[PDB]
Design a protein around this ligand. Sequence first.
Ligand SMILES: O=C(O)c1cc(C(=O)O)c2c(n1)C(=O)C(=O)c1cc(C(=O)O)[nH]c1-2
Ligand SMILES: O=C(O)c1cc(C(=O)O)c2c(n1)C(=O)C(=O)c1cc(C(=O)O)[nH]c1-2
Ligand SMILES: [Ce+3]
Ligand SMILES: [Ce+3]
Lengths: 577, 577
Amino acid sequence: NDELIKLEKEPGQWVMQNKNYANTRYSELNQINTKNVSRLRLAWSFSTGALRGHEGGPLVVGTTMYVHSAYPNHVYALDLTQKPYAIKWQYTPVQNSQAVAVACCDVVNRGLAYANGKIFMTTLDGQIIALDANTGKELWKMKHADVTKGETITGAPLVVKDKVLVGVSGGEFGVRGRVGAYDINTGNRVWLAYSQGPDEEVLLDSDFNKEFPQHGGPGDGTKTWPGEQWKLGGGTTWGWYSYDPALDLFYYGTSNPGTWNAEQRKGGDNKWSCTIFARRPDTGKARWAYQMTPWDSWDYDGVNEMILPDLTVKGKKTPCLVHFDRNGFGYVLDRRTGQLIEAQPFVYVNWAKEISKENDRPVEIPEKRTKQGVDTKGICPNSMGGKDQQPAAFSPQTGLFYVPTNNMCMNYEGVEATYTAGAPYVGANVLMYSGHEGKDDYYGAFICYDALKGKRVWEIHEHFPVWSGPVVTAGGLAFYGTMDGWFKAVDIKTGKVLWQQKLGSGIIGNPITFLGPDKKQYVAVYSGVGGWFGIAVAQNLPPDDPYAGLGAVGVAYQAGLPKATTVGGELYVFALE
Amino acid sequence: NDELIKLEKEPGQWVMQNKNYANTRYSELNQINTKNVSRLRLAWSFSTGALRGHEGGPLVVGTTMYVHSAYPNHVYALDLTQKPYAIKWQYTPVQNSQAVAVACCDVVNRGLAYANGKIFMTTLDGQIIALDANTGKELWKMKHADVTKGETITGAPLVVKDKVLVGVSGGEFGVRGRVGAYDINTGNRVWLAYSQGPDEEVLLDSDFNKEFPQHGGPGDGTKTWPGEQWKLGGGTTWGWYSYDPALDLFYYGTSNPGTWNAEQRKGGDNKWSCTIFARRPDTGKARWAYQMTPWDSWDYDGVNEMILPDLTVKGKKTPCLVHFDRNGFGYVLDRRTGQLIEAQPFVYVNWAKEISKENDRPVEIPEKRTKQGVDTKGICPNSMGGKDQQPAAFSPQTGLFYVPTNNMCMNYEGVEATYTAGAPYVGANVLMYSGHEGKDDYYGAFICYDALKGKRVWEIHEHFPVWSGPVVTAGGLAFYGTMDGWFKAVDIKTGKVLWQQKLGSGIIGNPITFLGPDKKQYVAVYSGVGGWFGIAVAQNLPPDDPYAGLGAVGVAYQAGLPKATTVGGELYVFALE
Ligand SMILES: O=C(O)c1cc(C(=O)O)c2c(n1)C(=O)C(=O)c1cc(C(=O)O)[nH]c1-2
Ligand SMILES: O=C(O)c1cc(C(=O)O)c2c(n1)C(=O)C(=O)c1cc(C(=O)O)[nH]c1-2
Ligand SMILES: [Ce+3]
Ligand SMILES: [Ce+3]
């Protein structure tokens, strides 16, 4: 989109969830820096009027801030010229409350998109809705997903050219993952790109994986599955999307291949679950695809963000894609072709020795691959991954990445799964605990990571998983939140905490930074705990069954989350003086 | 209670809702003052995990802060030694959710009491519950009110000696208002004092009103009503209680006399509705009582706080009771006898010329007394009163009062009412609007008032009603919140605002100030709009019928409250540094 390509360069605005199409989450603003951040204080706050998990973050376009909430997905426009703000408009969609019963991982929403004088939102119950950005008037609404089939929507849509790109959730409900493109003006569906099934549904361009046939090709959407198991094939698309306008490719990752009992998927790779896709936005046709975790047996969803830095590789400036996967590996690919440049662990990994440079496949440790009817113990990372959806940042100044991570392991036993449309299609008993096979007394870490060297530069051990995507700035600072409510600013060179404040609820939002109409720098973040690790608190679940929430309940209680935080939903905005 | 008499003198703690038994809401702390308050900033916050109206405030006892919420009435103990806090324990009572449907005026609760190692809470559904203050363990509980008869509890209980005093709500449901005294050590109900009915139920001491028999006497609880109309007689007890241990008297006010159609109560004063009671704590027996509004036709509940200052009256130090009634008059009584010393308007009043010096009865303006089947227009104040429950403060240094006020008027038409147990028993159509018979463009004011002179000293006009009870301090400051979310510090001498910050939701909490274990002064307040004026927002009500919420919906939309604030539930704590 030509407006967004222009606007995303402005230091004073924040026009899409991860700052720009490259998903760098980097701001050039330097009013707030390592010298003065100790003086940072709350400027103002705003209640979203919702409880449970508040993921994503606000947008700032012009002099208007756009705010979104957990279910029922209230949307607000705040006029920042009104000292400090006034509510310009609000919108709450009508939804089918049955959506709540088929949300796997809390009733979260990762946020709004802006383009062409319009705001775009997704709803838990499967709608994509366009609103007038200045009045809040509903312009069009479309049904993209079907709650009666166990589908929900939690991901933020992406506007590219005249299309709004919308995903789906339900990898634990046997859903056929896909991305739909809807016309920005009418909402009419233009194309629908599936993550499995026949080529006609997957949508492959004539040059698909041309340079890397070893990454797969035509027919693999069915041939790499037993029978018609692909019809329940997962590969959902609830993460963050990115875009390179020069290459005319947009990028995203896909979820686990449906049932968690790999026995019922045996015989093939189960493509294109756990896959990085690069597609043409006009047609949806794939130019390349790389499957990170063939025949997944761990729930290592591949949906984490696809950051698009230009890195110096073997002495030459190279258009890269960088992705910190649930499977614990930090991948660097050539974003033109899907060529694997590097893959090294960014957390402790014990299910695989390495990713092979020969065939780009994981070299598995067989004792850590799961199976039906027999437990597999001490798998690291757990299903929540080296990190979950919480997006990393990249600084072009340092050339390094700032990554929120999990530090947890699990036991995982496959169980026969039976499909009933609208009900869970899992087939696993999972127990979760702290990192390094339960030896660690902490469950998270915030790190600085060198993707090409495949090494951590520094690490901040955090008691709880870090479920907040940092913003990094030219002031030498990274901001992120903790699940017990601390909002922190750290020195990007050393990891030292330079400022912190305890807010009302665990933070699972991704902070932003922008300039107000007063030309002053502000830092804004949601508070309101939830998401998968926070499900025991958000859904008020008891400790009696530690297997509940597919392991999430036990581990949250072990880490002491329910004693550490209440539910909430508040936007906090900070500035100097 | 001897512990509370001792503790209430400590500058660093806040051991009951209005600071002390005299309900002065005054703190001797002066770390924060007129010279430095501009430097005040948020220190920390805590989400209550509930939405809708958050009335009252936290308690600070020792190094523990006790926090309460709107329905379902979560209770938390925060350990303030844990930099800045940790959740020490929490308790959520089991309730009958039918209570929500019979709450007149939002699902608020005015807060906790502390005494003798115990926390005492009330629940919307009619329970009084004693918890261990250090562990949160339930010690005892009793059913005090019955939701099937339209009873709820929203008021904060008061501990006096070895008794916890518990009121009831339901003046709009034909409830028989009463106060119960429960043994703090066992939960046994020791006595139960009704606001109407025969003397055996009202409970009168042998010297009742002996100095002022013109204020009423034996038998008036039935003889001042037509037939047995007293059986649906209201006089509920949902406001703030006060106590003078030197006099062995506790004090409180009573609600409207049930049906809003005065025609059905014609024939007498309807005692003891709209009444100030002084009762013996041992027996519940009344020593004196003064009815402010005989034969009410306006819903002028008498429940507002009974502040117990010692004032110089005609040169003599006098133990006074000062009360800013819903009816718009600022009453000063001798708290030994119920002598009426002074009564003058603290807001614009047009329903009465004055209170008679001859017999202490309002001199009514007949045109403004409401009637059955005919509309009466331009009545000031409206039923929300000169002020509602939001409690005023008194400074012993200045000898003046700092009062949050409403600036609103109404039309009110009596309608014949039919009693159905558990259903509303109102009988009125009420249209509300701004002050001075709808001429004004603002709906509230924060004032400094001289009670003996009967004069405002200064006034700050506020766009919304001021539904927040100030804390006033020896630093020369008054702190209060507005319904569009501004928390403000004013210079008590000039009435100038010296500091303000916009928070996430309208403030209907009453702020407190205390010393942390770090010896630093903090100011704390709930944010989370609701209560009667906020009902359109708290209950998500449309503007279609302006008469809805007994007039509250119309006036809240006219004032623009739904455009100004969202719902919430957050405790904000401020300090210097
Ligand atoms: O397979 C799926 O469709 C799907 C959807 C979602 C979601 O929509 O939030 C999550 C996951 N999987 C998942 O595996 C997981 O780790 C997870 C965490 C969260 C969260 O917001 O905290 N959502 C999801
Ligand atoms: O007569 C009653 O029993 C009763 C109860 C309550 C309550 O319990 O909150 C209010 C009132 N009346 C009332 O008249 C009124 O002005 C009012 C305002 C509020 C509030 O919290 O904002 N409660 C009540
Ligand atoms: Ce999944
Ligand atoms: Ce009332």
